[PDB]
Each structure stands twice: as C-alpha cells, then as structure tokens.
Symmetry: D3
Subunit: 338 residues, 6 copies
C-alpha cells in the first residue's frame, strides 16, 4: 500500500540484483544491473562481482570509468596509467578503488575471497563487453604478437584461443615480493581509497562518509557517499542540485520517497540487494524501517558531491516567507531544525 | 517585403512574448518562449514574469540554470548554495541575478511590483514543471514530514495540499531586520549584479554592457551583453565563434539580418518584447530602424562572451587579399573602419 | 584473404581519398572523407586540398575547429582571434596550423603551390558548407554593407554576387611588406607549428612526433602523432584509453589490425591515400608491409595525447599473474620488451 | 486573457502566414509554415502561393504528397502518373487537387491569377527544396541531356543555368486546343476535385464538406473537411480518433480550445491566414467570435475522415452513467443534443 | 542457478506486476508494466486493473488501441465508433474486449466486481495519461460547455473540477432496460469476444485459443493466443516470424528459454503476476514446472497470429540435410514428431 | 574529373564488394555491404555469397526479408511458411528467390557450385547476426530439446556445440526422391522466380526485366528491375516516385549521374562489383561507358515497381509550357522522344 501522497506516473526506480542473470565461472560469479534492467538510470550502471580466494578478474580495460566499493573479503588490484607509471595495492571490505576511462587493471581475491560493487560511467555498460587480454591476443596474428614480444612463435603455442574472464589462481605473495620494477615509478596519487583514513560526518540518526575528488584525487568521474543510519532514523528530505543519484543498498531495509516535479511522487521499499535511482534534482528521503543499521551508497557521475537539505533551506529563509508558504505560525516555523 | 539578398530555407527566428499563452494567478502572471514556440532555439529558453507588490514567486528549484534581467520595479531574492551558505538581496530595474543548476531560491516583489525576464539553460524549459516547496510537501507523507521537522503530525494540519506558484504577500521589512543567522555565513560571491556598477564599452552607434564570468563570477553557465543602439545606428556585421545567440528586445525597432552558411539568408523585423535567435557562428547585423534608442539582450549559453567583427577581420587581413576577394581597389579597402 | 584470427562484424574502417568526389575550381581542388563516406568515424572528418601557386582559399570560418598537416609546397595563413589580435605566417611541408571554433582565417599558396590535409572536429563536416566572406556579402543588403563600411553604395557595385571558394591570385610579397598594422598586436601564441622545432620520440623501428596542447598551446581540441616506421617495422600493440583514433596515411603500405571488444577483430590493408578510424579504446597494431618508409598521422579529438602499450602493461604486471593469464612460464614472460 | 479553465504546458499551436518569409518572384510569391515555425505539427506542412495571370509554378516534383485548396482565382494543372498516363484540368476558387508522392506536375494561373493553399505529407517540407525541371537539367552534363533528348547539344544553348521556380507566361489556350497526345491515355481518376460536385453535411451552426478517399479516390494520403460556421455558431466539442489535425483559417475570427490529457488545456484566437494544430485525439472546440462566417480547413494525414462528438458519446451512454459522471440529474442529461 | 546453455548479454525480460506501483481509488486499483519497467518491450504495455462491484472506470479514450482479457468477475463495457454507432455488452472471466485507437468507452463492474488485464499498442502508455471525460469538462469554459449541451450555466454548477478516474456506483440494471436508443444503431461487429464461442486447438501437452482478426474482426491492431499447458507439458520450440511477443502469466510456474541471435540465450522463471517479452523472431520454449495447469497469454501488435515450429521445420526438410546439420543418423531424424 | 554540372554536398553513393571483409568457411565465402559501409542506404543491404558444390548455407531465419538474385551456378532452396506449408526448388543463374520476414530456409549448392546476391529489407543487416539452427540448439538445454523431439538425451550427444554457418555436404538427389511428405502440402505460390518465364520490355539500347508483386506474388516487400544496356546506350533520365534505389552491378562499367534537390548533383563511375544508392525521388541516369553490355539490378523496398521518365513527362506536357521552360523552340520540343 503506497502513501496517500503518491501521485502521477513515475518510472520504476528499484531493481534487485537477485533478479539479475548470474554468469557463473569457476572462481567466481558476476551479475549486473544496467539500463536494460532499469531504464530510469541515465548515468551509471552497477555490477556485483564475487571471486573465490586467489581467483583472477582477468586483465582488462574499458571505455567507461570504474568505481568500486569493497563489500566483503580482501583483494589485490594492479593497474597502469597513461604516463607509464604502475600501481599495485591490497584492500579490504569498505575500501574503494577507481580506474578512469581506458586505464587497464586487474583484480585478484586474496585469502578471504572477495565480493565488490563496481559502478560504470555509462548506463548501458556490460561486463561481457570488456576488453580482455586473452581475447585480444586470441584475435591477434601470432606473427604479429611474436614481433611485438620480440620472441619466436613457438613459445606462444599455448596462448589461450578463448577468454578466461574469471579464473582460478593461487593467492599471491606480499606486494614487496611480487612488485615489478618500473623506471617511471608509481602513479602520483593512488587508484585506491582506504576508508578508515576518512572520518564521517555524524548526524542525528547515523554517519555519512563523503568520497569525492577533494578526498580521492584520481576519482574525476564518479563520486559517492556511504550512509549508515540507525533504526528509527532517517536521511532527511533533500535533493542533489547537479546530478541524478544511483544507489546500492548494502544492508538493511528502507522506505524511499521520490518527488519529481509536477505533482509527481512515488514511494518504494528497498532492501540489501537493491539498486535504486533518484532522478536529477528530485526531492527524496530515505527512512530506516528495519531493526539493523541501514547502509547504502549514493553514487553520482560528478567529481564533486553536493546536496541541499530542506531544513537548511527553510532555516535560512525569512520566517514570514516560510510561514506564508506553509500556513503555519512563525513561532512554529522557528522550532524546525536548523 | 524581404530584401532581394535573402535566399534559401532559414528557420523562423522571431517570436513575440505577446503571442505566448499567459498564466495569470492571484498576485502575478507568467509567459514563456521555448523550443515549443521557437524551435530554432537549441540552448536557452525565456520567461517573462510579473509580480504584484509583495507577491511571492514560490520557493522553488530546477535542473536548469537561471539568468534574470530586471525589466521594471524592485524585488528581493533569497537562495542557498550547495555548501549551506545563504543569500538575500534587493534589486531594481536593470539589475541581474543568476542561480546555477539546482540552487533553490525565492523572489518577492517589493513596493513597486516587478517585471523581469528569466533565461534558462535548456531550450525546453517550462515554468509549469518547476520543483515547488508546497508541491513537494503536498506529496510527502505527513509522518515523514513530521519526523523531518522533528515536530508532531498535528502541527502540519494546515499545510497546503496543492501548489501556490505565485501568491500574494505583504511587502517585507528591511534585510537588516528579516535576515536569519547562518553559521555557514553568506555566499562568497553574490548571486546578484547591480548594473550601475558596470561601465559600458562605447562605440559609434551605441553602448554595450558585457556581463560574463569575468564580471559576474557565479554566472558560470549563461552570459550576456546589453546593447543600446541610437537612432540611425547599427550593430555592425559580426559573429560569435562559440555559441548560438538568444535575444530579447527591450525597447525600439530593429531590422536583423542573418546569414547562415551556403547562400542562406533571412531578414526579420523585431520590436519590443520579441525573442530572437541567431544560429551558431552565423553572420548577422542589427540595425535600429526606429525613432528611439534600441535596447536588447544578446544572451549565450557560454561562460565567456566573445565575438568577431567583419571590419576588424578585413582591416587585419592583407589588403591585396581583401581587394581580390571583394573586387574593390586597395585604396578604398584601406578606407574601411578598423 | 583475411587472417584466421579475425572474427565478427566490424564496420568498415578504410576509405580512400581517391574514392572521394573531387571539387575542381579555378586555382585548386578539394575532396573530403566524412561519416557520409566512413560512418565508423564519430569525431573527425578529413579534407584534402590543393592550391595552385598564388591561389586563394577564400576567407572563411566555420563552427568546427581546424587542425592541418602540410603535405607539400608552401603557403601563407592569416587569422584573427576573439580579442582582436591578428596572425600571419608561412609554412612548408610537414608544418601544421590550427584554428579553433569560429576563428576566421585564409590560406594562400606561395611560389610552390601547396597540398595539405585538414581535420575537423565534427564527423559530418562539409567543405561546401563553410562561412564564406563573399557568400556573406552577396547575401547582405548593399545599404547595410555600405553603412558597415560607411562607404557609398557606388563603391560596392562590383561585389561578387556569388561565392569564390577557391580562386586565382598572384603569389604575394614578404610578410614584412604585406603585414597590416594592428594596435592589438599579434596573437600571444602562434596558430602555427613548425615541425623543425620538435624532436621525435624514437623507438626501434621508427620515430613519432607527438603534438598536443602541451606542445602546441592553441590546439585545445585536436591533437596528433606523426609516425614514421621503417620497412620491416611495426607500431607495437597498444590502445588509446580516451578517444577514437583517426588516421591519414601519408606514404607507404600498412597492415592494420584492430580488436574491438567481445572477440571482434578485423585486419585492413592501408595505402598512401587512405583514411582510417580505430574505435575508442580498441586495441591495435600497425605494421609496415612495404619497402619504403611508412608515414601516417594518428589524430584525436582530445587536447592531450595518451596511449598504453601492451608490452609496458605486462611489464608492470606481476609475473605469476601474466603467466597464469597467457599459459606461458615466468621465464619466457621475463623475456618480453619493456 | 486566457480562460480560468486553462492549465498546464501545451505547445504553441498557432502561426500566422503573415509571419512567414515571403519569397517573391517575377510572376508570383510563396510562403510556408512548417515545423520550423510550428514544431507541434508532426504530420503536415502548409504553403500559401500566389500566381499572376498566366504565371507558371515550374514543372517539378517532390518526395511528399501534396494536397491543394484553391483560395481565389483560376488555374490549370498538369501531371503524370507512374503508368505513363497524363492529366490536365482547370479549377476555380474552392476546388482541390492532389498529387501523390513523386508525381510530377505543373500549375499555371489563367486570366484571373490565383492564390492557393498547398498541404504536404511531411512536417519538415519546404518549397525551396523541391525538384525543379530546370534545376535538374542545369545540373546534368549537356552531352547526357542531348543523347537523352536524341538531339544535338546547341539547341540546349539557351537552357537555363539556374532554376525558374515561378516565372511569367501567357494565359494558355483551351485544353481541347492544347492537349498533347499520349498513347497511354488519361489517368483513370482525376487528380482534381471540383467542389460544386459535393453536397455539404448540414448542422445546426453551419456546413461541413468532407473530402477523403471515399470522395476523392486518388487522395490516399491526405483528407480534409471544409467547415463554415455561422456567427454565434460553434464546432461542437469533439476529437479525431486516428490522427493529428492541421488547420487553415480562410475567413473569420475563432476561439479554439484544446484539451490534451492530464489537466492540460490551452485556448487560442485564430484569424484568417492562421495555421493551427490539434494534437492527436485531443478534445477541442472551435467557436466563431466574429460577425462574419468562419471558414476553415481541417486537414489530416489520413485517407479516411473520422471524428467523435461528445454529445453523441453522452447520448449513447447509459443515462445513470452520464449523470454519475457529471453530477447532473438524469432529467437534464436527457436534454442534451443527440 | 542458470543453465550452462545460457550465454551472452540479453536484456531482462521479466517484470512482476507485484513490483509495480499501485494507484488506489475509491472503488478500485490499477498498476502497469511498461518500458519504464521493461525496456525490452517495444510494442505493447500492460495494465492490471481491478474494480469493486458497481465501480466505474471513467468514460475515457486514448490515442492507443486497447485489448483486454477478463481475469475474474464480470463487467459491462460501452463504446462508440467513428460512424456514431453504439456498443454495449457484458462479459465474464475469460472474455475479451477491443477498442481501436481513439474509440471512446467506459467500464463498470457488475455484482461480482472485476479484475482484468489491458494491453495497449504502445510500450510507453500510462494509465495516468488517459483522456478523461470529467478532466476535459473541468478544463473547458463553462460558457462553451453550456452552448455545447444547449443548457444554461446554472445547470453546470456541480460539474467536477477534477477527474474521477475510478469511482463507486450502483450495479446497473439489465442492458435491455438501460440501453439508449441510437438512431444510428449498433456497431456492425462487437467490440467484445465471448470465449465459449471458440474451440481451442489441442496438442498433447495442452490447449491454445487463437484470437486474431480472422476470429475477432474489430481487433485489427492486437491479437493473442491463450495457452494452457498441463503439468509435465511444454510449449514446443518455436518462434513468431513477424513480431515481438508480450506475455502475461495468468496461473502456474514456468521456465522460459529465449535464444536471440549470435549465441545469445537466457532462461527465466515465470509465475502468476509476471509479464514477459520475447524479442522478434527469437526462438523460445515455455515449460510448465509446477503442479497445476499453466495458463498464459502470448500477445502481439499484429492483426494475424503466426508461428513456426522447429519440429515442423525439420520434418518438412530433407533428412540428409537435417542429419548433416545435427550429426544425427537419418533413421533417428525420421522419428521426430511431425 | 567530375562534370562541370556536379555541385554541392552529396553522400558517397558507391561501395565495392571487393572492399568488404570476406568471411571464409570451408565450403564457401560471404561478404556484405550495409550502412556500416554505405550510410546513404536507408532501406536495403546486400550480401555476396558463394557456395562450393553441395555446400550448405545452414538452416536459418531472420527478422528481415530476403530477395535473392542468382549470379552463377545452380542451387536448391527449402522453406516453410507460417501455415505449415513447405517449399523446395532448384534454380539456375538469372533466377530469383524470396523469403519474407521470419520465413526459415536453406540453401545448398548443386553440381555447378553457386554464387548469389542477397538483398535484405533493413540497411543495418549482418550475416553474422542470423538465427542459426545449430546455434539455437547449442544454446538450448538438451533436456528441453529431448523433450521437444520426444527422444532420449543420449540421441543428442553429437549435436554441434557451435554454429556451422557454411559447411560442406554432398550434392543431393532429385527433388522427387528427397522431398518429404507434408499433410499441409506445398505453399500456394512459389518462393522462387524462374526468369525464363518473363519477357523483358525492350527499349532502344537494351532490355528490362521488371519483377514486382504483380509478377512474383510472394515478393510483397522487395521488388527489382534487371537492366541490360548495350554499349553506347543509356538508361534515360528518370526518377522513382516512391522509394530509394539500391543497385548492384552484375557486369560492365557505368557512368551514373544523380540529382538530389536544391542544385545538388554528383556523378560516379560504377563497375562489375559495385553497390550503389540513389536517394528517394532523386533524378538520375545510367550510361554505358564500356565495350560489353552493362547488366545491373535496381532494387527497391516496395512491392510495386514504378518510375517516371523525363521524356514521357515532357511529351505529355503542353508544348508551349515545355518551350517556355527550356527556352527552346516549339518545333524542336515536338521532336523529343515520346
Ligand atoms: Mn574493469
Ligand atoms: Mn540523496
Ligand atoms: Mn550578436
Ligand atoms: Mn577553414
Ligand atoms: Mn594508435
Ligand atoms: Mn507541388
Ligand atoms: Mn476537429
Ligand atoms: Mn481505456
Ligand atoms: Mn511464443
Ligand atoms: Mn533508376
């Protein structure tokens, strides 16, 4: 039963990962929520990926930018930038990584295994359309690859003739034991973000970690806010002035209300496996309706996080004006949060 | 009777605000010219709005950016930026304001009433599709609103159940009396521009006030030039190398000739209240053909104003080249203004 | 007969200037390759132009940005910027010029005649739809032109009533004797790039000059790399992470291999007159299959050049990782170029 | 001052031919209203053309189908169908003609001169991009034209090198003196409709002539209704179930009210020479608000005319239903016109 | 856990009505599945609507065509065609109705209440964007309505100023005593289809009712197949050569396998509330995986039903060919069903 | 060197099959020309296919329609229609076949081998995106297929795990000994057209076979004209009033001149392997400039062939009109061909 205040035609704004197709491979599985599942999304698409301990996410690159939140476990990522500088790191649950457009990279689960959420900067992304190393070489002439590698063709007899995508491997050693020497050195700012290094803005019902370009300098395309709200609390009525919002609910149960313009309003129930979308500058709230902390990510195709809270808007507006607006006494306006 | 020099298929570039449907409300009226009326417009849309003394344009926001030229009267504007800092000011005829995308604001006419022109950073804008405070709260559950405001549900019984848009109010007190304290402070650069602060570039036939981001720093999306051309004068043949041009004619009568590419040319007569469009990098002139000084706004979806004049181009081009081009002697080409 | 490793549906990527329609004029000829010829090109379009000694390319402008490589001969360019500062220079084979959007300019061949390649910042550009001075003036009322020049209309009796486009003239004098005085002075950074000022990056089989905004400051829209590859040489396997690639072969014979995503691969034979396109972030190689040096241009709609080589990528990647990927031992992997 | 019952954003639906550019030629003039003037039109475009006595509209053809209503004067039209069959006729004020897609034809005014309205089956038509006989031959090699006509090239010496479009001529002789012999014979059904052959449907306030494919068999693409409404009369509330409606107001002053769905309503005043558009299945009324008979054409891109009257709908609806809907007693519902 | 025989990226093809937002009214409720929920749907949109006894679905029309399947209960429909002929009928569960584009109609539940499925001839339809009688009259001037009904304005004082959409009423009397006298008579063929008049085609695993234009003459836009499959049964491997398929599952549990081209295949699990889509000419099967009979609707935007069965295709094909294809002996090919 | 009469921007209208990628399979080869090679084509796409004697083109179907011309050799086709009726026939060079949308079919070369041209009813077609029998079953679960065929899964052990597309087989026996029995019988009209059954209309320089739905009833989507032009002859100036033209040149060298509207004209040379495009209603000619007869196919997405010749148009127009048009004498006009 929807609220008495819902009205008009608003698109579906919710899709569960459990309704997504499961590509299962030895060493892990993958599934995605794209604009082919949720057409209200115009900026971002999400992939939920899981790797068994030591399993590879095959070396690859793509036209889109990658933003990743570590759901569980631990993993190692490697990458190379456009100036020939290399990057290597290990991360645990709660951490992020970020590869801007066309930056090649790898992921390998460590002893714990891993599950992570990836966000891609085009709404029509697909994991089955990424540029894979083994696919690339499987479709390059062996004389050409031999000339490139400066070796003889016989050495390349056992190159795969078909991609691996996600495949099993052994847990690697320590970084200092595996890191390869590069005369260009490392990338000047990490492609990774370790989350204890940031402390969250605390509000009444919970906490918010804001990770944008001002916190994570390489993240020039996608930014996010990790929100944790205790039971009975609520993310207050607000909107984002610059961009559509793309949500992934990590844990808990929420009631989400969205008001587009023109008497348009809809309310949805979200839970821990769901992706949601808030249209651009649409006014919305997210209320905890479960007994455990509600954790989710607001993600945006925008290097800068920004939002606007209704309470703040009214607090800075002349009191007689808000009173004439809301048909409530100035005295009662004066007691709203500030 | 068009000039014999006109040729080819050129879109219509003229539309009168008097030919737009007028939304009249208790306390004011509004009418708009968009790509639903002038499809040659690809960047901007115009709104002509009128407020009775003390009347509010309801607290609201939109996805688009706002640029406003004050036609008549006086008014007060309030706003809040993305970092929580507030803004309040009074403006008179000739002044400007600017709200970048998603910045909420209110307008209240003062004792004189006011008429103003608003320009929006999308060609398909509509005043009837704005995000209104009362609409938002009318479509939010009352328990949710109460929890947000941290008050009891009964307090919100007299909340409007329907938008106000433009409604009557009493002329407010002085800012020094009505302003609210904000621990975040004021916005660092005003959302307002007082036009007496600006000196015009003066040429033979008139004056041009140029207001772009180097003059009006918050205006990062839309910039403009106010042009006044005396009787017998002309805006010389020129073009803008980076963007389409959108005109509003304040006063006077003009003959405007536009040359798109490929032997396409069309001539229009404009008068006060007309909206016009010059295609991107199209060559054009604007001649005063009336008894009175001609005043209009050239407005652009571009942070930097720029143009290129024909006479300057020829004066800097080698004389033999201009001579071979125009079949005119070097001596008289040397006679052109520089 | 295509290689066994090619697979799938890849668009055509090759189009010959010899297959483009030739507009012949008094004083020169022109032909173009656009997405009306090569729909896989989404960013840029190419124009091949030839001018007889002393011949004019008519004074003109366009919405698009111009990046030009001088194929043969010598020529003079003139231009004017938005701040009223002028530019004039002479250039030889191998030199470049660049006029950003809407910057008006002219070209005149010198004693040798000239042939040059122009690349434009929209894939649907057209040489037959540029903004011509005489086309403009032929479609402006003569009273208006008279007022603009403030001459009497008698002087304008011989204005062309029709474009000239490309017309004959005398080889002009030295810059020092023909240059016109401009109180605003010259442009602060040249619209020209003399290739003798830049040393090539040299690798084993050849050389490449990289010219982008860090080398050629006015070129904020288009960048390029001029590549020369000795017989038996090859441009090593790589991709461009940010942009589509647009190629013009100057001289020689090449075999070009392209790997799009999803096991998509195609091989092409390219020749002296040919235009090619490599899709965004597509992996590719370019092998010289002739006995004369292969010269070509990689051009991009991007102010910064960027690429990533497979050799460097594997070089910076952990050896066990590369070995697990490619089904070859660490020992032979340790033998790849770096 | 719009009715208080108007609401919401409705496109502009009115455009006056007097605001369209007038292409004037020796022997006549032309002007058009297309989606470049009235973007709410998605099906049809209008042309208002005037020919001096004996004047030709040049032999031509186009991709679109044209429907013509003769406003004043008399004319002769000729055409050819796809089976090699020819057609020739004379027509007067009030008469129609119809040329399906690609059917070539000519128009020549007779002694009175003529003005006529043409309607075209694409909203983006323009008269300046029609296929002209002289244009065609002016851009065909003269040897090719010579071989085609089986003649030698010097008779083609005075072939126009440029179109004629509208040029002067002598009022031709009688058809029985002028008709050329065609072994394929005449077309089986005339490309013309003489309006005196048609009985009007008579209603309370006026007359309706309905001409669709059941009446005018060749007009398989465009149909129409000529409506005349007496002073004080009204075109009753109705809608057209299958297509958009395109109007030309021949004479009088009208108030036209349009209701799209979702509480969207707009009201316009129309006068002679105005073109209007009613969106698909939109409900509308047309009231005469002048003292002279209101005459206009409702035109549709549809071979069959159809409409549905509100009064008829209510009369055929169960009385308790109409009452339950309108909160009016059965006693009153039984009194509506049926 | 998907089958291994699945591969590649196929859009989501399943959406549950229970995940669609519910519009609740006094007397009924509504919910829809469109391409805002199911973007793979390119032809049709679905509405699940339920009415309380005596409740009206308001008199209305829409630009799209309506095809309706009666899920439960009984109801009365009324309509009017383009020739002024009337229609009224009652239907029970399992029956259909059909209103082509713009045909006005009403629905009123009888004593039992009703639930029905509506399918509309555009994928972006919306129940909240329908043309309602009262919405229309609420936005028509009262003087205009007074003239239209030929009554004085005092009678129209109680006209709704706002839509009703779905509202309560009394179960009406028999058609014979409530039917209104229309001098134009009844429509020539009913807008209704009583399913007991049609015998199903029987196959061993179930039954198929095929309803297209040859059986239901007014239904010229949408046709359907009602399929019932016993436990252990299967709708054999087949495709439809001319159209997309739009599915609504009435009862049961199904496993549906879809094979698009190019090794793309996906399998879904369907049940009672679900909507599905089969892309055009895609090969598919539907297996009953429950204990109860599986009942569903295959619906098409196509007046004629068509399919092609794999078994028949192979049976009519030369056995040497089928054997050469499938690597099966001829004798085994000879025992496939035919 | 293009004619003096060419002018303006025309798309490229030519592409050679020799420039298309050739997919080689044991037993044959295939290559295609689509809008990824020739973006001016908006209706049709071409495939050039060659099958070794006895080789199969795998059993398949597609969304688009097939119209095919037999270039050389002989072949056998099989198909099944939507009413369960089967078709089988063998054909030789010069014959056609036609399978409407979604009609499944097979091709097998006979003793001679075969090469044929296929034309498809969408411009973005690709042979590598066809629905293949083995692809379908290889991506269908084998339990499902076994239940479908009512066999044991053991039987399905050797089903391919991958498409066959083009594979070798033995040249089959006579139709009467291989045709399978079908209780529904054969299709009422053949999907094949034997060209010896058609007499060509003979004109002066050559012959024309016109094959459309009035000649070839199953061909309701694509029609064609086979044109043979003797040396020194020419296909006269003409245009097609209803559709774009798609050409394939069987034999010879041609000069083709195309006139779009608005002074747009371009001329191309076509030869033995070329595909061409003529825009809709564009006026054009095709002249033989070789020493052998020029044979080509004009193909159209239109069930009815139609064209309009300039000579017929002028012969049927009043002579004074043609004379005033062309500035030619009435007597010289009267000697034009008729
Ligand atoms: Mn990745
Ligand atoms: Mn938010
Ligand atoms: Mn300007
Ligand atoms: Mn240029
Ligand atoms: Mn490259
Ligand atoms: Mn015409
Ligand atoms: Mn009407
Ligand atoms: Mn309905
Ligand atoms: Mn089916
Ligand atoms: Mn032709």
């Amino acid at each position: 039963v929807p609220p008495i205040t819902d009205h008009g035609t608003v698109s579906n704004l919710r899709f569960s990962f459990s309704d997504a197709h499961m590509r299962i491979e030895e060493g892990g599985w993958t599934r995605e929520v794209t604009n082919r599942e949720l057409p209200a999304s115009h900026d971002l698409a999400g992939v939920d990926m899981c790797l068994k301990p030591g399993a590879y996410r095959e070396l690859h690159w793509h036209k889109e930018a990658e933003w990743a939140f570590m759901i569980a476990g631990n993993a190692r990522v490697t990458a190379l930038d456009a100036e020939g500088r290399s990057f290597i790191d290990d991360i645990n649950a709660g951490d992020l990584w970020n590869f801007e457009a066309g930056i090649p990279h790898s992921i390998q689960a460590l002893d714990q295994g891993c599950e992570f959420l990836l966000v891609f900067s085009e709404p029509d992304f697909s994991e089955n359309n990424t540029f894979l190393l083994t696919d690339w070489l499987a479709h390059t002439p062996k004389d050409i690859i031999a000339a490139n590698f400066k070796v003889d063709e016989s050495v390349l007899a056992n190159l795969p003739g078909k991609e691996k995508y996600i495949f099993n491997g052994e847990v690697p050693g320590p970084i200092s034991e595996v890191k390869k020497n590069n005369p260009n050195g490392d990338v000047p700012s990490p492609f990774t973000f370790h989350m204890n290094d940031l402390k969250p803005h605390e509000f009444e019902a919970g906490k918010v970690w804001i990770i944008d370009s001002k916190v994570f300098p390489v993240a020039q395309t996608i930014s996010a806010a990790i929100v944790e709200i205790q039971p009975g609390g609520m993310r207050e009525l607000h909107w984002h002035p610059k961009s559509e919002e793309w949500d992934y609910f990590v844990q808990g149960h929420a009631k989400v209300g969205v008001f587009n313009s023109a008497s348009l309003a809809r309310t949805f129930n979200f839970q821990a496996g769901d992706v949601g979308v808030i249209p651009i500058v649409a006014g919305h709230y997210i209320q905890n309706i479960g007994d455990e902390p509600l954790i989710f990510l607001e993600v945006f195709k925008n290097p800068i996080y920004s939002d606007i809270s209704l309470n703040k808007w009214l607090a800075t507006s002349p009191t007689q004006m808000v009173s004439d607006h809301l048909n409530i006494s100035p005295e009662t306006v004066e007691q709203f949060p500030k």
